[PDB]
Amino acid sequence: PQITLWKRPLVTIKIGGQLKEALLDTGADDTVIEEMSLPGRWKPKMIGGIGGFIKVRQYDQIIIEICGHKAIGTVLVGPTPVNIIGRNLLTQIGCTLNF
Amino acid sequence: PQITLWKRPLVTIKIGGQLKEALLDTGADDTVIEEMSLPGRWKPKMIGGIGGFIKVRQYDQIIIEICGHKAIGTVLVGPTPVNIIGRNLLTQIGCTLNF
Numbered sequence: 242p243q244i245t246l247w248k249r250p251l252v253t254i255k256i257g258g259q260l261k262e263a264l265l266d267t268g269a270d271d272t273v274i275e276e277m278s279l280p281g282r283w284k285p286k287m288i289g290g291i292g293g294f295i296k297v298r299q300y301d302q303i304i305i306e307i308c309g310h311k312a313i314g315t316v317l318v319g320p321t322p323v324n325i326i327g328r329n330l331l332t333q334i335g336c337t338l339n340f
Numbered sequence: 341p342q343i344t345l346w347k348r349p350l351v352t353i354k355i356g357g358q359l360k361e362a363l364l365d366t367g368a369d370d371t372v373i374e375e376m377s378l379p380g381r382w383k384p385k386m387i388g389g390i391g392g393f394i395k396v397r398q399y400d401q402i403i404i405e406i407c408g409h410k411a412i413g414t415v416l417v418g419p420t421p422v423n424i425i426g427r428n429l430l431t432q433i434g435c436t437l438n439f
């Protein structure tokens with residue numbers, strides 16, 4: 242698909258058996274999702290941006306379906322105001338910027 | 341151009357006659373640049389990120405080149421951790437997400 246940027250590029254994702262809305266975010270290195278259960282070991286991480294940093298839990302080898310495209314990668318879980326699909330998963334669905 | 345996301349989508353911009361590096365950020369509604377001098381009056385704005393908020397100065401109708409593409413629009417100035425080109429200007433240069 243081609244997604245314009247007149248509004249926030251929000252898409253439906255499936256993760257851990259749950260449906261969520263998430264923002265395709267080329268400015269994000271990492272993918273960060275609101276609190277939810279995920280399988281496996283985790284380690285703590287701090288991620289920062291405007292406003293400062295939040296503490297998240299890092300889970301690896303998590304499968305996500307993004308707008309119908311399956312990908313696997315690291316997913317951070319924590320108190321993010323918005324669910325964010327970052328570059329680590331955008332690459333896996335073949336997402337590019339074009340102009 | 342077509343820009344992949346294996347690395348940060350950093351580009352050269354020109355603003356106030358000077359070249360700077362900036363990130364093409366589809367997760368950002370607005371464009372925010374590090375402290376610099378811009379002409380005219382400014383208005384207050386707050387922008388929200390993953391860790392909270394910052395106050396910024398809003399300047400309108402600012403001339404700015406992004407990857408050599410000419411734009412004129414709203415530029416926010418403040419303590420952003422990186423120069424960010426957001427959707428307000430990405431739309432002006434005809435930028436889309438594709439996969």
Ligand SMILES: O=C1C(=O)N(Cc2cccc(O)c2)[C@H]2CNC[C@@H]2N1Cc1cccc(O)c1
Nearest residue numbers: 268269270271290291325367368369370389390
């Ligand atoms: O503030 C943030 C933010 O926290 N991040 C960083 C981030 C967020 C999530 C994961 C990750 O690895 C990094 C940025 C990333 N793009 C816009 C995310 N923003 C929003 C933003 C920024 C500038 C101007 C705006 O109008 C909006």
Ligand SMILES: CCOC(=O)c1cccc(N)c1
Nearest residue numbers: 268269289290291365421422
């Ligand atoms: C502490 C470093 O902060 C960041 O990576 C960042 C901040 C604002 C926007 C974006 N896209 C990234």
Ligand SMILES: CCOC(=O)c1cccc(N)c1
Nearest residue numbers: 266322323367368388389390
């Ligand atoms: C308080 C509202 O916060 C946001 O709009 C936001 C947070 C993190 C990443 C991005 N891209 C946006």
Ligand SMILES: [Cl-]
Nearest residue numbers: 313314315329
């Ligand atoms: Cl990953």
Ligand SMILES: [Cl-]
Nearest residue numbers: 332335344345
């Ligand atoms: Cl590729």
Ligand SMILES: [Cl-]
Nearest residue numbers: 413414428429
């Ligand atoms: Cl604008």
